[PDB]
Amino acid sequence: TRKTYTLTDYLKNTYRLKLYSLRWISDHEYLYKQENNILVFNAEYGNSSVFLENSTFDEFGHSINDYSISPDGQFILLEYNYVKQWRHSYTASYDIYDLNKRQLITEERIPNNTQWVTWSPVGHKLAYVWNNDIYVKIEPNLPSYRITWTGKEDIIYNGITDWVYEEEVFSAYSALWWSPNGTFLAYAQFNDTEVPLIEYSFYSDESLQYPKTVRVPYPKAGAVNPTVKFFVVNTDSLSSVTNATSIQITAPASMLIGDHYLCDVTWATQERISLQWLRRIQNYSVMDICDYDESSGRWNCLVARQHIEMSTTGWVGRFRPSEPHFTLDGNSFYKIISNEEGYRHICYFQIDKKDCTFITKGTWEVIGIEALTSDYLYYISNEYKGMPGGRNLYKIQLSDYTKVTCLSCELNPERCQYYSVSFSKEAKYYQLRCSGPGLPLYTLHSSVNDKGLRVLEDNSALDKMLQNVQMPSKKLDFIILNETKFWYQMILPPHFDKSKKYPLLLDVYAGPCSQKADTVFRLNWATYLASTENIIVASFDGRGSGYQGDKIMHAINRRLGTFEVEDQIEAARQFSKMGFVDNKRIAIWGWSYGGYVTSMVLGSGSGVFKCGIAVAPVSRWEYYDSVYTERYMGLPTPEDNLDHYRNSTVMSRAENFKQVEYLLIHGTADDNVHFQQSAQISKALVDVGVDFQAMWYTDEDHGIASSTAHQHIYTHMSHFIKQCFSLP
Amino acid sequence: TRKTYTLTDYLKNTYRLKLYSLRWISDHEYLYKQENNILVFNAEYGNSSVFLENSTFDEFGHSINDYSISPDGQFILLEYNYVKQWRHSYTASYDIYDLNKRQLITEERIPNNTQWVTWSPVGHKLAYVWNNDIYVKIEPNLPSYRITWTGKEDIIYNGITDWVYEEEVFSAYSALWWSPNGTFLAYAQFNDTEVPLIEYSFYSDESLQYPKTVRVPYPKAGAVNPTVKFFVVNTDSLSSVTNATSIQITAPASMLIGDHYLCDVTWATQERISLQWLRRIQNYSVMDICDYDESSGRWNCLVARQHIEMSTTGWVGRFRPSEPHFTLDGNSFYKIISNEEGYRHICYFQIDKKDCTFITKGTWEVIGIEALTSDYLYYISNEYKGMPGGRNLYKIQLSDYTKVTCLSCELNPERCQYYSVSFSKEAKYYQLRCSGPGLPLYTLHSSVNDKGLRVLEDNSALDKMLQNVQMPSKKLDFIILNETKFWYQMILPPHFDKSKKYPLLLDVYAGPCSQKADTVFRLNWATYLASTENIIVASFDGRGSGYQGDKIMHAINRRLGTFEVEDQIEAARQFSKMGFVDNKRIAIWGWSYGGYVTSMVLGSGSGVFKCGIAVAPVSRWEYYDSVYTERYMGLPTPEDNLDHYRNSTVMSRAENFKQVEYLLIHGTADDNVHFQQSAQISKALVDVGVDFQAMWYTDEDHGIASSTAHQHIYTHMSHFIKQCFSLP
Ligand SMILES: *[C@@H]1O[C@H](CO)[C@@H](O[C@@H]2O[C@H](CO)[C@@H](O)[C@H](O)[C@H]2NC(C)=O)[C@H](O)[C@H]1NC(C)=O
Ligand SMILES: *[C@@H]1O[C@H](CO)[C@@H](O[C@@H]2O[C@H](CO)[C@@H](O)[C@H](O)[C@H]2NC(C)=O)[C@H](O)[C@H]1NC(C)=O
Ligand SMILES: *[C@@H]1O[C@H](CO)[C@@H](O[C@@H]2O[C@H](CO)[C@@H](O)[C@H](O)[C@H]2NC(C)=O)[C@H](O)[C@H]1NC(C)=O
Ligand SMILES: *[C@@H]1O[C@H](CO)[C@@H](O[C@@H]2O[C@H](CO)[C@@H](O)[C@H](O)[C@H]2NC(C)=O)[C@H](O)[C@H]1NC(C)=O
Ligand SMILES: *[C@@H]1O[C@H](CO)[C@@H](O[C@@H]2O[C@H](CO)[C@@H](O)[C@H](O)[C@H]2NC(C)=O)[C@H](O)[C@H]1NC(C)=O
Ligand SMILES: *[C@@H]1O[C@H](CO)[C@@H](O[C@@H]2O[C@H](CO)[C@@H](O)[C@H](O)[C@H]2NC(C)=O)[C@H](O)[C@H]1NC(C)=O
Ligand SMILES: *[C@@H]1O[C@H](CO)[C@@H](O[C@@H]2O[C@H](CO)[C@@H](O)[C@H](O)[C@H]2NC(C)=O)[C@H](O)[C@H]1NC(C)=O
Numbered sequence A, B: 001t002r003k004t005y006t007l008t009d010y011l012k013n014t015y016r017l018k019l020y021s022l023r024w025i026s027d028h029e030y031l032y033k034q035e036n037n038i039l040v041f042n043a044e045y046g047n048s049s050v051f052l053e054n055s056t057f058d059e060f061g062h063s064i065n066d067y068s069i070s071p072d073g074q075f076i077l078l079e080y081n082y083v084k085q086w087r088h089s090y091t092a093s094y095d096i097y098d099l100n101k102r103q104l105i106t107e108e109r110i111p112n113n114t115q116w117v118t119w120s121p122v123g124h125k126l127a128y129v130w131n132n133d134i135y136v137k138i139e140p141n142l143p144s145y146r147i148t149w150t151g152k153e154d155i156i157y158n159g160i161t162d163w164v165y166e167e168e169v170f171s172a173y174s175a176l177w178w179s180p181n182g183t184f185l186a187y188a189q190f191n192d193t194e195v196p197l198i199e200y201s202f203y204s205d206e207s208l209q210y211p212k213t214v215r216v217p218y219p220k221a222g223a224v225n226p227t228v229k230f231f232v233v234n235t236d237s238l239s240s241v242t243n244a245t246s247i248q249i250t251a252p253a254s255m256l257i258g259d260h261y262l263c264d265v266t267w268a269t270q271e272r273i274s275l276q277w278l279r280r281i282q283n284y285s286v287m288d289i290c291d292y293d294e295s296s297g298r299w300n301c302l303v304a305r306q307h308i309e310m311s312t313t314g315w316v317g318r319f320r321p322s323e324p325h326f327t328l329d330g331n332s333f334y335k336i337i338s339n340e341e342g343y344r345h346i347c348y349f350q351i352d353k354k355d356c357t358f359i360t361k362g363t364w365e366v367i368g369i370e371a372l373t374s375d376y377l378y379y380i381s382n383e384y385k386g387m388p389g390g391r392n393l394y395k396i397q398l399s400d401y402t403k404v405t406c407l408s409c410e411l412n413p414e415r416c417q418y419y420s421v422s423f424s425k426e427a428k429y430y431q432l433r434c435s436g437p438g439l440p441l442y443t444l445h446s447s448v449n450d451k452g453l454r455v456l457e458d459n460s461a462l463d464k465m466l467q468n469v470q471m472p473s474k475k476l477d478f479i480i481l482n483e484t485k486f487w488y489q490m491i492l493p494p495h496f497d498k499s500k501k502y503p504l505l506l507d508v509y510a511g512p513c514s515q516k517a518d519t520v521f522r523l524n525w526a527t528y529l530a531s532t533e534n535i536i537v538a539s540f541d542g543r544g545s546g547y548q549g550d551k552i553m554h555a556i557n558r559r560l561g562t563f564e565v566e567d568q569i570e571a572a573r574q575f576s577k578m579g580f581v582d583n584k585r586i587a588i589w590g591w592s593y594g595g596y597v598t599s600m601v602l603g604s605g606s607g608v609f610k611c612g613i614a615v616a617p618v619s620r621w622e623y624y625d626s627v628y629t630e631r632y633m634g635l636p637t638p639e640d641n642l643d644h645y646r647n648s649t650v651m652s653r654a655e656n657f658k659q660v661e662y663l664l665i666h667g668t669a670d671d672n673v674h675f676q677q678s679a680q681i682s683k684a685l686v687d688v689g690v691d692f693q694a695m696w697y698t699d700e701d702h703g704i705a706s707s708t709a710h711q712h713i714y715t716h717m718s719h720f721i722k723q724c725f726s727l728p
């Protein structure tokens, strides 16, 4: 008999997806790690040599976390003693190894506890951040030049982000931007002097007698934000002057009038940089285009080259204003912007004309611009078959916009409906990554005629293993509400029979611009629930969801905790109408925004749901950070949106939890959604005499992702769902 | 058929015990609050007058928390704006009402946020502590004299205790001691400069955007302790123009050689004070007897008058060295000390003689000396019927030790086996307070011929109510281990039938010198479990337990988490073989030390217990405070007892929790047993893959005693026990 996909299968990673992670080092070659050996592959023919033997660093004395090779191929940066900070940030030690002379460098080493390091884009200059200040090495073995002196722990950040810029603005820790040939180093400086601190206990190993208090500058909604400045230094002057001058580029007057953010930095040429700025009220953004002036040594941004983007129905961009892609000469650029119908499409700008030309259109959206050549622009969209949850690679002829070719749509239509892409240095080659609905498939292509050169990884090994398992199926479809299609997916038990009635778990996220119905193949907890426990696991993308235009996405503007919550309840009613759901056994669960929505649904008094699980939920918008929260909610003041901030809390719905079984879970060291949020939910439930189940996870963060904690939480949740559904 | 005692009855206080709380104001009269009116009673005849009408302060404008009348009856201190701190400490505002004028005092008022206030023992002087400094008022409407100028929040404490002296040494916030006629004010000063802080989050009301971090100087085991100094000031020679001179009494040389504590302060005469000092290794203590020298102005403690008290088998005293009771002339004293066999009895000392004479003896213990006259010493003991869990009042004739009279034993032997007492100022009269096994009974007596004057409160109203309820019964008996009897009690369901098999819950505390098997009448959770759920609730006093001599009490010296744990298991094993216990349904629960023992038992692998609940448990002795932990454990150093500190943790037993159902509960704002302790238990269980149930209580402290939290925790625990025992 074929076994099912069990909880242990999921928790012990018995059935692993194979990857093919490569790193392009040129237009024709990439690096790849095969059994600890770093190999160089030739793209055209597929042959390889050993770049770095696995035995090279056997006597190093430290486990190597990662490597980074200089762009000129002369040096390799070895990263070790990795200590994670937030989602992207960490500290590490670094050694540099000379490849041409086969030697480690012991002279003038990068310090321990270095926060960030990057090679220049050409050659082998290094910039790094240490104790919140920027340093530059022209040569790996020579003394560093200090660039900034103002760095101060938790206060002034030079060339790295503070908590909120890392998580909500840049999705990155770095704040250093080398010019294309490495002459200039641009950087941001953040000042968190008056930003309040979130404080929480960290217990550590049992040996630690007194708990540590972690203290992090973190602006909650409406609080004092960090301020920002932007600078550019000429690194070629460093060896000639004792102290090189950092030249400030100031934000536009339209930004300086109040609170604002720096939201994009993009080099256009050797001597031209674009900066995007965003008002704290995030429906107005300004792009400056700034040129170096040789005679004055200053950077000037002509107003004739300033571009404004605003939104009358919501915020700017999906999560921020989109990034520009400059043509080689730097005199024009392409950018995804919302069109007059509210659909995100590629627009083409000359740097000194304010009106752009849309080069794509239709009732679907461009997801990202991936590459730009003299002849073609390459982009990912969900055009194909009008499925907003699919992703394909297209190219558009720059001399004739009517000529658009899909490069991935027909490669394997049944197996592959969701693609991402990685182009070589000048887009001569590309790797396609298919992630579903079948098993992941990695292929390599040449851009001249888009020929498929070879299959890199086809997951044949996993395919063989899964033959002996009763795997669930997946249905992706839509329901029509008020003349609008809303997409859903169901993970269906093996041998699914529509004449029978199944328990159902609604797996919710539902944050603005999110998508939970797609064509991606996943091996996760839902796979187990469907395969082993015969539970249907459903998800629904309602109002506020992404990739379907602004009419849908902006529906929850200034009104979080309303329509997107109502639409999950309605989805459950619609699934019941399909005839194969046991209406006595409907449950709901989610994590973060999904935890908030789960809790709001459970507190609604709808009577639809028997039970639910909230993991690390938001409970009150005033407890979450300014950049994310205010994007959708504006400010929590009587003059703006305080009334809605106050009636969209989980705590106000406490009395209605009397009608449901609730399990509330939170990691105690969650720096993102603070434990505070669940502590206030539990207190409110206690105050009204509602019984519920709880679990804290000591020292876990938002991911609850340590190997043991991951296994424990899914085990605890599994018992709860099974009890709720009367399943042995 | 009649109702049972329900969970709601317990939680809503449906059946209330009546009290009779009086305060003696002389040898002949006492005060008593009846219907908010304060009445004065004549002891001899029982007639009364209204002292203060309940309407006097109708226009006061504040809710009055408490009152304190001056010893001369001329003033009343009114306490309001009460804000709780720790177990005993709080701050408050104070007004003073002048009874001669019938007016509130409007000048030179006691400051807001006052930490402690006390009248002199005679007359109407006041001493108070505000912002950690001591002040004295000679008359209530006159300006205060500032005694100390060194007070500093969290650092220097004058006349009040720090966290650990409050909880573990004096069981009080005050560290001020007036001489008998009010001439001198003695005080301690605590210095916490190098004591590390426990830090934990406090979430407050939902309106608070950022959690607050609470920081308390708290020495965990082996950490830097507070240091102490002792001073005496003459309040009769205070000046408006000169700062007050405090005279220091330094600790003896035998104490100064290392870390030590001040553990007792007792005035002997108007010009003689006794102090007891205790080494940090608490098996050695010294009493100094210090006389005022009217010509030098010093306090001199003659070496010839020092008294050493040491223990070879354990620590000194039950929880600290006992208080002396000085004779009229202050030249001799009576004190409870452990005799040669290890039983605590009254010893009679001359102040300048090394050897004392035991005036009581036997294999039972004196609980406390309650009053001393020239003729008689009055004491409470468990002599009667050799029952260590009973308490009676005795007097011994000081001129003839063969003449011992039990004053309470025969008053009402079926109803009353556990007494406490309150004597009038010079012991002309005493109130007896019986607390079981029947309903509490309060009576008044005269000392001259031990006449029973009147019944003050007999709880006949509650008796009438309980006749309509199926109440449980209580069995008190013993089992014999190694020729030693160990006492247990069982709360037995109504209509108990020994041919039937009942589930059993073992209610455990089992801390050193504790007693859980006694003759006290209680209305509590156990009452409900037995009455309504038909569960037997048993408790057992094994090794380490109190009031039965040092052989038993000192058995766990340097070895907490050994014999007292093993003895609970052995007890339950014996119970499980009794023909009326279902061996498949035995549970265990406890709070604090009881949570520790519950957890240690559940991690023992004994297999005896199906499930258990630990509330606010200790998990590792290095996490608890120095004064308590080291008394039993010594220091956590390789040279002392580190190995046993490391072997006695809950965390080390995590693997054994695989075969039990465990529920772990802790208040997040517990300043006593820190949330840290349970956070470490949960992390250990997660690390070995053990599933368990958890509940945190936001902003609750060690008591989990807010109205709503109290109701919630017992509701949660009730569901858990009922599910464990398969009860509907
Ligand atoms: C990073 O830290 C390591 C380990 O502390 C440093 O290596 C040595 O550490 C030992 C003590 O363990 C000391 O004797 C020296 O300070 C170090 N000696 C040498 C030869 O390195 C190391 O120095 C640190 N790295 C940098 C770049 O400062
Ligand atoms: C970062 O911002 C702070 C202001 O929030 C600046 O620090 C000072 O702030 C104090 C009080 O907030 C003022 O008295 C000063 O005028 C500010 N300036 C200085 C020089 O102390 C601070 O200067 C900023 N730091 C940097 C590096 O820009
Ligand atoms: C990197 O780019 C910079 C900026 O364009 C180049 O430096 C300039 O070169 C031009 C012409 O070669 C000179 O007129 C200027 O004096 C230079 N300006 C500055 C600020 O340096 C530089 O040539 C490039 N570097 C390399 C290695 O090609
Ligand atoms: C950006 O959003 C703000 C806040 O909604 C808009 O502010 C206007 O001013 C106040 C509220 O701040 C109201 O009296 C107006 O009705 C708001 N206008 C609206 C809601 O349309 C501001 O108009 C927005 N900017 C853009 C370009 O749409
Ligand atoms: C209890 O009763 C006695 C009277 O028997 C009270 O003593 C009397 O007090 C009143 C006024 O205070 C005087 O007029 C009498 O002269 C007193 N008589 C005696 C014999 O002393 C006593 O005050 C009462 N006590 C209380 C508390 O009400
Ligand atoms: C205790 O605090 C109260 C309130 O702050 C003080 O109240 C006084 O009366 C009003 C408000 O009730 C204030 O405007 C005055 O400043 C206060 N002063 C006086 C002289 O009454 C009160 O005084 C404080 N008590 C003490 C003893 O400091
Ligand atoms: C309270 O205790 C501290 C010691 O913990 C005393 O302060 C000094 O402590 C430092 C080390 O922390 C030593 O260098 C000094 O010798 C100590 N005292 C002096 C006077 O130098 C502090 O003085 C004490 N305060 C009081 C009021 O007793």
Ligand SMILES: *[C@@H]1O[C@H](CO)[C@@H](O[C@@H]2O[C@H](CO)[C@@H](O)[C@H](O)[C@H]2NC(C)=O)[C@H](O)[C@H]1NC(C)=O
Pocket: B181, B183, B234, B236, B270, B271, B294
């Ligand atoms: C309270 O006790 C004190 C201390 O014994 C008494 O004051 C002493 O007694 C006499 C007063 O006549 C003097 O010789 C001493 O100088 C006093 N000592 C001090 C330290 O002041 C006082 O008399 C007692 N009070 C009463 C009312 O008897």
Ligand SMILES: *[C@@H]1O[C@H](CO)[C@@H](O[C@@H]2O[C@H](CO)[C@@H](O)[C@H](O)[C@H]2NC(C)=O)[C@H](O)[C@H]1NC(C)=O
Pocket: B281, B283, B310, B311, B312, B313, B634
């Ligand atoms: C009080 O207890 C301490 C420690 O338990 C005893 O100290 C002795 O001396 C040193 C210092 O710790 C140790 O090496 C010895 O082993 C201790 N002797 C023992 C445990 O017998 C001290 O003896 C005890 N005091 C009394 C009166 O028994």
Ligand SMILES: *[C@H](N)[C@@H]1C[C@@H]2C[C@@H]2N1C(=O)[C@@H](N)[C@@]12C[C@@H]3C[C@@](O)(C[C@@](O)(C3)C1)C2
Pocket: A167, A168, A319, A511, A514, A591, A592, A593, A618, A624, A628, A672, A673
């Ligand atoms: C939960 N995911 C958390 C609470 C609310 C929704 C916001 N949360 C975040 O962590 C945000 N920092 C991000 C920001 C973007 C968009 C997200 O939907 C997903 C994310 O990875 C990137 C994290 C919410």
Ligand SMILES: *[C@H](N)[C@@H]1C[C@@H]2C[C@@H]2N1C(=O)[C@@H](N)[C@@]12C[C@@H]3C[C@@](O)(C[C@@](O)(C3)C1)C2
Pocket: B167, B168, B319, B511, B514, B591, B592, B593, B594, B618, B624, B628, B672, B673
């Ligand atoms: C729990 N009860 C806690 C942990 C360990 C046993 C000690 N605990 C205390 O709170 C102590 N501070 C006290 C000290 C004495 C004796 C006790 O048994 C009871 C108490 O009220 C007085 C508190 C333990």
Ligand SMILES: *[C@@H]1O[C@H](CO)[C@@H](O)[C@H](O)[C@H]1NC(C)=O
Pocket: A040, A041, A042, A045, A047, A048, A049
């Ligand atoms: C691949 O093969 C070509 C010859 O066919 C050779 O020139 C090249 O060096 C090889 N590349 C690698 C990375 O082995």
Ligand SMILES: *[C@@H]1O[C@H](CO)[C@@H](O)[C@H](O)[C@H]1NC(C)=O
Pocket: A149, A243
């Ligand atoms: C370098 O110059 C900057 C800007 O004037 C100044 O703040 C800093 O102190 C200087 N550093 C040194 C070492 O002179």
Ligand SMILES: *[C@@H]1O[C@H](CO)[C@@H](O)[C@H](O)[C@H]1NC(C)=O
Pocket: B149, B241, B242, B243
């Ligand atoms: C009393 O002592 C304090 C603190 O040293 C000082 O500020 C004050 O002036 C002193 N008063 C007199 C009268 O000396």
